[PDB]
Design a protein around this ligand. Sequence first.
Ligand SMILES: Nc1nc2c(ncn2[C@@H]2O[C@H](COP(=O)(O)OP(=O)(O)O)[C@@H](O)[C@H]2O)c(=O)[nH]1
Ligand SMILES: [Ca+2]
Length: 178
Amino acid sequence: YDYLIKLLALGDSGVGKTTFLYRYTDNKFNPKFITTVGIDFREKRVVYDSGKAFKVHLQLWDTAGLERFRSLTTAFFRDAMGFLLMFDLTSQQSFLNVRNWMSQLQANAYCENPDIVLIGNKADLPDQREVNERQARELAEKYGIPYFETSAATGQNVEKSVETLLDLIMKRMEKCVE
Ligand SMILES: Nc1nc2c(ncn2[C@@H]2O[C@H](COP(=O)(O)OP(=O)(O)O)[C@@H](O)[C@H]2O)c(=O)[nH]1
Ligand SMILES: [Ca+2]
C-alpha cells in the first residue's frame, strides 16, 4: 500500500451516496460498524388536584444509545482529508441543507482542514431539475471547490469526480510534505 487516503460521502438521505459508491468501487470488501440506537417510555398513573380531580396518565420518554452514536460520528469524521459533498439535482432542499451546513462550518487549521468537493447527483433525470447550475456555482465559488454534474446511474463524472478528489489532497499534502 502506498498512502492511506480517507474520503467521506456527505449529503442528505436518498441523494444517492451509497449508490454512487457501489458502482464506482468495483469490489466486495465492505466492513461495517453498526451500533443500536433507540427511544423508549415509562408510564405512571397519578391523580392531579377548589380543586377538580383528574385521572392523568404520564408517558415519560427516554433516549438510549445516544453516546455510542457520538463515538460513531467521531470514528466517521476522524483523520478525514476529502469531502464528497453531494446534493440532489431534483431537490433544492438538498442544496439548502448543504449551504447551511457549509455556512455553520467552523474552519480549522489549513493543513488539518479536509478538502471538499461539491457534487450534484441525478443528472440522468433532467426533466425534474429544481436546481440551477449558476445558482450552485456561486456556492462553490464562495468556497473554491470544484463541481460535477454526476449521476451514479449512467456513471457520469463518477471516476473524474473522485480522481479530482485526490488531486486536491495530494496537492494539499505537497505543502505539508509529511
Ligand atoms: N436515476 C437516478 N437514481 C438514483 C441516483 N442515485 C441514487 N438513485 C436512486 O436513489 C435510491 C436511493 O439512493 P441511496 O444511494 O440509497 O441514497 P443515500 O442514502 O444518500 O446513499 C436508489 O434506489 C437509487 O435507485 C442517480 O444518480 N440517478
Ligand atoms: Ca443509502
